[PDB]
Design a protein around this ligand. Structure first.
Ligand SMILES: [Ca+2]
Length: 492
């Protein structure tokens, strides 16, 4: 027996958790075993480990006719809310008040987070993944290449173009071939964020293609003329080969592949993990050195960092109506907002990945010296995964090098990080319009955007066509619903 046990008799719950198009909950995970040891609750995966489309698996599971006990994963907020209201998940409000003191206390001190996850009917249908941090992504460039070519870090978009063209044409890796790929990114969506360099927003938050507020008006970045003009530049950069030809398909291991193969020279990614490649590639890519740089001033005269750490992500887990043990389950969820639970969900397993020293979790030297980023190491063990848990930034601080820290501090002091969109509180009727049209609009936008970047469709020649589609697909009605919600909260 442990003080953290939520039940006297071992309880096994079925969980469908497929996330980030690559992982599934694994009961054999070191962290999964430790979770069971500490709570007396075991989670058995019913997900398809071989599947590569997390959202697709959620959809299939919901129509299986055999719902599990718990459902978890990334980017499921909208589905937890919609399906919760439709009767697939139980509301957690009262369960929390009565049996989840840590979560209750957390929501009391973070009322904004609680309001953000609530459905129009006022119910909480899932416990979210709460990030801890301030900044998210930043710009990184190859300083070793700048030195070889006698170039200075680019201070504005004109200089950035010049530098990237030099990386492309001056053989900085020295193999006598034009194989360098200036800009690379493990997140395809970052290619669109490049429009920031021409004064156009690409998203209102850390969630790609998100809405934003401009002087009290709800807008979608991809619907504005500034985006049209910015995309013409991005398309030109792709045509000139300054952008990875495979930017839309490389994905996940783009850094390992492109930096490891000494081809990439510039990216927009997270400070902690991106800086790990300097030590990680020290042997395989002699001289490799990425440095963080302030966002080059855009064409309009402003330095922009559009990304920021979210107060709460659209990830987490919920209790299905078929779960016969809702009380034990909410207590289990509560464990992840308590210090003991935050320890394993953030650091792994004691005696394996960390040890308690001076009363706090400290990563072992083996973990800190590994060439693989600490978060990547933890994913494979069941830690830093998108379940409902309270992230602890000290886990990240421990593997954030002085160089990475100097970059973070530079961005904070420079005030480059743009305030993120926190969302609006729609009524049931308003959100119904959102559920009806948004997913469709978003997919269409992405498909048109990819065509524009790859040059298969002309931005100017198809802009009016694109606008007609946005209207008949309901984007403007969605914006209207959101404007009404915004006004109820901030105006009148
Ligand atoms: Ca070369």
């Amino acid at each position: 027996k442990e003080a953290t046990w939520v039940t006297d008799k071992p309880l096994t719950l079925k969980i469908h958790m497929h996330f980030r198009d690559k992982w599934v909950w694994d009961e054999n995970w070191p962290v999964a075993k430790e979770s069971f040891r500490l709570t007396n609750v075991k989670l058995q995966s019913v997900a398809n480990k071989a599947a590569t489309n997390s959202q697709e698996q959620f959809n299939l599971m919901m129509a299986s006719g055999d719902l599990p006990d718990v459902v978890g994963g990334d980017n499921l907020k909208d589905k937890f809310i919609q399906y919760g209201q439709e009767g697939a998940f139980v509301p957690l409000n009262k369960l929390i008040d009565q049996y989840a003191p840590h979560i209750k206390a957390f929501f009391k001190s973070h009322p904004e987070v609680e309001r953000a996850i609530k459905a129009p009917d006022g119910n909480i249908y899932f416990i979210p993944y709460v990030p801890d941090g301030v900044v998210a992504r930043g710009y990184f460039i190859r300083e070793d290449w700048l030195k070889k070519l006698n170039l200075k870090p680019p201070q504005n978009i004109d200089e950035l173009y010049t530098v990237l063209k030099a990386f492309k044409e001056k053989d900085p890796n020295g193999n006598g071939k034009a194989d360098e790929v200036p800009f690379i990114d493990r997140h395809p969506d970052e290619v669109f964020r490049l429009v920031n360099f021409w004064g156009a927003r690409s998203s209102g938050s850390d969630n790609y293609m998100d809405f934003y507020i401009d002087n009290g008006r709800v807008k979608h970045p991809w619907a504005e003329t500034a985006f049209r003009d910015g995309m013409k530049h991005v398309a030109q950069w792709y045509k000139e080969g300054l952008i990875d030809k495979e930017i839309f398909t490389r994905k996940a291991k783009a850094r390992e592949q492109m930096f490891g193969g000494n081809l990439g020279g510039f990216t927009h990614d997270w400070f902690a993990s991106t800086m790990t490649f300097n030590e990680g590639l020290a042997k395989t890519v002699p001289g490799f050195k990425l440095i963080p740089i302030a966002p080059p001033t855009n064409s309009k005269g402003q330095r922009w960092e559009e990304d920021s750490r979210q107060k709460v992500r659209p990830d987490g887990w919920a209790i299905t109506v078929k779960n016969k043990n809702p009380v034990e389950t909410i207590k289990f969820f509560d464990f992840y907002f308590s210090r003991p639970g935050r320890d394993i969900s953030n650091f792994g397993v004691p005696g394996v990945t960390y040890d308690i020293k001076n009363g706090k979790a400290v990563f072992k030297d083996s973990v800190l010296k590994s060439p693989q980023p600490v978060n990547n190491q933890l994913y494979d063990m069941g830690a830093q995964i998108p379940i409902g848990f309270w992230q602890d930034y000290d886990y990240e601080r421990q593997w954030t090098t002085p160089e990475a820290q100097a970059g973070i501090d530079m961005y904070v002091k420079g005030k480059y990080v743009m305030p993120g969109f926190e969302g609006v509180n729609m009524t049931r009727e308003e959100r119904a319009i959102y559920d009806k049209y948004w997913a469709d609009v978003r997919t269409y936008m992405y498909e048109m955007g990819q065509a524009w970047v790859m040059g298969t469709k002309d931005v100017d020649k198809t802009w009016d066509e694109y606008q007609r589609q946005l209207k008949l697909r309901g984007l403007y009605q969605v914006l209207q619903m959101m404007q009404q919600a915004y006004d109820r909260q901030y105006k009148n």
